[PDB]
Design a protein around this ligand. Structure first.
Ligand SMILES: *[C@@H]1O[C@H](CO)[C@@H](O[C@@H]2O[C@H](CO)[C@@H](O[C@@H]3O[C@H](CO[C@H]4O[C@H](CO)[C@@H](O)[C@H](O)[C@@H]4O)[C@@H](O)[C@H](O[C@H]4O[C@H](CO)[C@@H](O)[C@H](O)[C@@H]4O[C@H]4O[C@H](CO)[C@@H](O)[C@H](O)[C@@H]4O)[C@@H]3O)[C@H](O)[C@H]2NC(C)=O)[C@H](O)[C@H]1NC(C)=O
Ligand SMILES: *[C@H]1O[C@H](CO)[C@@H](O)[C@H](O)[C@H]1O
Length: 358
């Protein structure tokens, strides 16, 4: 019976699935967009405003005044100016701005020369700040909570940040089917095994009624019960199986780690007779019977249609997280430098008075 599903025959598939199941209820840090440069630019805007004429200061309203409501620069800059005016209203803020810049009690001629000296500096800093602001916006949905929810959808079919647990109603799309064979199919019209947890049930469960493949996923599982007939009571058996797993992903979670996990699974799916299979398959279907199979049947999956594996909900959710992280990793690294530059521009602005006095 070497060709039947025996204890440990799905052990290596189970190690890969355990790594994926450990993405449930995840508490990870994400790569941080360094936005300290936004504050540095705001400080430059405040210095610029402080040094401006009484006529300019008088402008500061929800939109530019009549005559400028359609000027594209005023439309762009209005909220930035308004924020600077508001921040300068705060007790002793303007005095602190001027002191940092060497412009306390500055003669009027010096205030004007200083403001003019800031024109090229601010023009250089604008596009740097605008890129940093764009990165912030582009990445604002790459958060620990959004990742946890997506990964809990992947593992357990539960769109929640924490407290996700095995429940067949959520782990199998629409709950378990009439038969194990139908429950353990994914990608077909009647796709059912749409989570990592359902995949583990299908690849690892002990069916009731004899001729089961208990301990296919490892001899150290203590199957205290079974999955029932046709997965009717899979939850108790899943608890025994998952108790043997304690994979931990790298922290912070990376796109590379997630991509490597999906590639590993992809490299293990085997094609036979027009379907793909994860887990040992002998004949008939992925039924939980030792002489048939303990597997997921990727119905109609072939090497040439493998793109469809990436549309299965769990795979798509993990892929989406990986893609979000892939972008945020790079944008976080870019933002470090944008922010350091903007802080450097603030320091430059604070020095122009020394030059001009001399
Ligand atoms: C630091 O703080 C200073 C103030 O101390 C602030 O300066 C102001 O910046 C705005 C930037 O848009 C300047 O706006 C221009 O204003 C002229 C008209 O100027 C009169 O009116 C203002 C209103 O109070 C007075 O303060 C000023 O002294 C003048 O009396 C407009 O003609 C300009 O429009 C052209 O440029 C825009 C781009 O800046 C274009 O979007 C617009 O379409 C216009 O360009 C087109 O027309 C031009 C024909 O003239 C042509 O040459 C172009 O090629 C194009 O075809 C603009 O609205 C304002 O004057 C500045 N004020 C002072 C006192 O300097 C800085 O902005 C602030 N720094 C930063 C980085 O925030
Ligand atoms: C698993 O159970 C099925 C259905 O009873 C049987 O056909 C196989 O021989 C057994 O291994």
């Amino acid at each position: 019976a070497a060709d039947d599903v025996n204890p440990d025959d799905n052990k290596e598939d189970f190690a890969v699935l355990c790594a994926l199941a450990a993405l449930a209820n995840l508490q990870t840090t994400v790569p941080s967009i360094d936005t300290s440069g936004l504050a540095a630019y705001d400080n430059l805007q405040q210095l610029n405003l402080s040094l401006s004429s009484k006529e300019w200061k008088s402008l500061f309203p929800k939109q530019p005044p009549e005559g400028f409501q359609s000027d594209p620069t005023w439309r762009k800059q209005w909220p930035i100016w308004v924020t600077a005016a508001a921040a300068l209203k705060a007790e002793n803020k303007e005095a602190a701005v001027l002191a940092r810049a060497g412009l306390t009690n500055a003669p009027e001629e010096l205030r004007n020369r200083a403001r003019l000296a800031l024109i090229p500096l601010l023009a250089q800093a604008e596009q740097i700040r605008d890129r940093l602001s764009e990165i912030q916006k582009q990445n604002e949905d790459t958060t620990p909570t959004a990742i946890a929810k997506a990964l809990n959808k992947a593992v357990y079919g539960q769109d929640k940040e924490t407290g996700a647990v095995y429940n067949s109603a959520d782990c199998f799309s629409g709950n378990v089917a009439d038969s194990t064979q139908n429950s353990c199919k994914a990608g077909n019209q009647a796709s059912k095994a749409t989570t990592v947890a359902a995949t583990i049930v299908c690849v690892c469960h002990k069916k009731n009624g004899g001729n089961d493949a208990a301990n296919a996923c490892g001899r150290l599982i203590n199957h205290q019960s079974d999955a029932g007939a046709n997965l009717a009571t899979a939850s108790s058996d899943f608890g025994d199986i998952i108790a043997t797993c304690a994979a931990r992903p790298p922290k912070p979670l990376t796109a590379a780690y997630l991509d490597s996990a999906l590639a590993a699974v992809s490299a293990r799916i085997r094609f036979k007779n027009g379907n793909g299979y994860l887990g040992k398959f002998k004949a008939t279907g992925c039924t939980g019977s030792a002489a048939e199979g303990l597997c997921v049947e990727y119905t109609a999956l072939t090497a040439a249609t493998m793109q469809n594996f990436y549309k299965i909900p769990w795979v798509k959710e993990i892929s989406n997280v990986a893609e979000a992280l892939k972008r945020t990793e790079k944008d976080a690294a870019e933002s470090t430098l944008l922010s350091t530059t903007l802080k450097a521009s603030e320091n430059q602005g604070n020095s122009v008075a020394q030059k001009l006095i001399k």
